[PDB]
Symmetry: C3
Subunit: 106 residues, 3 copies
Amino acid sequence: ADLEDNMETLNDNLKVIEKADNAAQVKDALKKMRKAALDAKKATPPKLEDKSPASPEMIDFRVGFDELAWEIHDAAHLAKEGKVKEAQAAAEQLKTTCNACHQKYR
Amino acid sequence: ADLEDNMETLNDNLKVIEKADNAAQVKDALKKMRKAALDAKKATPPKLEDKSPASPEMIDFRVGFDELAWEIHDAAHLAKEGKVKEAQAAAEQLKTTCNACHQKYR
Amino acid sequence: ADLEDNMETLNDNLKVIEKADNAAQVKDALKKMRKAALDAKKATPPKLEDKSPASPEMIDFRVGFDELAWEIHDAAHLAKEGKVKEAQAAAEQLKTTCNACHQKYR
Ligand code: HEC
Ligand code: HEC
Ligand code: HEC
Ligand SMILES: [Ca+2]
Ligand SMILES: [Ca+2]
Ligand SMILES: [Ca+2]
Ligand SMILES: [Ca+2]
Ligand SMILES: [Ca+2]
Ligand SMILES: [Ca+2]
Ligand SMILES: [Ca+2]
Ligand SMILES: [Ca+2]
Ligand SMILES: [Ca+2]
Ligand SMILES: [Ca+2]
Ligand SMILES: [Ca+2]
Ligand SMILES: [Ca+2]
Ligand SMILES: [Cl-]
Ligand SMILES: [Cl-]
Ligand SMILES: [Cl-]
Ligand SMILES: [Cl-]
Ligand SMILES: [Cl-]
Ligand code: NI
Ligand code: NI
Ligand code: NI
Ligand code: NI
């Protein structure tokens, strides 16, 4: 998928998680987020398209999705132990990782 | 190890997992797969050797091993909870990630 | 943070883990290690600054931090199951991954 579609998937599933009623719904949404994070890692964002493909900025962009995938994995750990409310709160905390990348490159 | 040896390790351990008799055998095989996936990420495949080192294709190649490592990690989660048959079925499902990369670059 | 500060964070938390008295202290230290490993992945080490940004050596450097992050994650798994002594021993085993990168690039 392209970068914009992966971002919608990320945004839509944050809300799905917030409103989820059970562990399986949070787990499923978090799995879609991880898939979208890894897929976004393949793109060149518009504001970096003039940079070289392995410029420090493009490396920082790609590693941002590794950081997001690891944070998603911690939240998924909580959902798999059945700690649904703690997983929902960890998911909402993802926004600081979202924001950090946005402030630099979006 | 070189790319071809990492692929054999991946292929051989898929079969080891299929025939495994207990959780520890699946766990051990999945750990060897993850190690091989990360090691393969360092290579340039023959059909991409004319591309630039951070070309979209080489990025897509390397991220494919992140996707495989994450899918392996989900299967390993199942083996560590003792759900041996579910882990064996998740391992067989890895083939769709194997195939997707192969269809593009092998 | 810069590469040198991320390495200190890695070194300091290995010792924190060795002397830890409970699971939460090991968990917290391992989380700081993962964060530092991913952050170090954004740097160019001095001995590679003449290489091209996606040279095989820079790829090998960056993938070394993926390998370290995955090994840290296995240790964290043990700390979250309450197997504190096994997690402490896994952490000390990280040194062979530290050493392998150092022998090549530091
Ligand atoms: C960098 C490593 C990023 C991370 C982590 C996240 N996002 Fe992102 N996002 C990024 C860029 C460079 C862009 C611009 C894309 C473009 O083509 O202009 C975006 C965009 C979005 C959007 C807007 C999508 C649209 O309709 O055009 C949304 C809604 C969005 N991003 C959400 C989002 C969330 C919820 C994240 C964390 C879970 C997140 N992003 C991470 C770069 C990066
Ligand atoms: C890209 C991201 C890949 C993923 C994921 C997997 N493989 Fe692969 N494989 C890839 C390439 C580019 C090649 C060609 C290597 C070459 O030098 O020609 C291969 C090759 C194989 C082989 C053949 C090895 C040989 O004897 O020459 C096998 C048996 C193989 N791959 C298996 C395999 C499995 C089981 C995977 C998932 C678990 C898998 N590969 C993933 C690229 C990629
Ligand atoms: C490559 C993939 C590395 C891994 C994994 C680890 N380290 Fe490292 N380290 C690396 C380099 C290239 C350098 C040189 C940095 C420089 O600017 O010269 C280092 C350095 C250190 C240091 C010295 C820091 C200082 O005071 O200058 C320490 C104490 C250190 N590294 C520790 C360390 C530990 C404990 C690791 C595993 C947990 C580890 N490093 C991994 C490259 C890489
Ligand atoms: Ca839009
Ligand atoms: Ca649009
Ligand atoms: Ca609800
Ligand atoms: Ca609700
Ligand atoms: Ca062959
Ligand atoms: Ca051959
Ligand atoms: Ca058998
Ligand atoms: Ca059998
Ligand atoms: Ca120093
Ligand atoms: Ca110094
Ligand atoms: Ca102590
Ligand atoms: Ca002690
Ligand atoms: Cl996950
Ligand atoms: Cl790269
Ligand atoms: Cl990467
Ligand atoms: Cl794993
Ligand atoms: Cl971890
Ligand atoms: Ni895509
Ligand atoms: Ni190798
Ligand atoms: Ni895990
Ligand atoms: Ni930094």
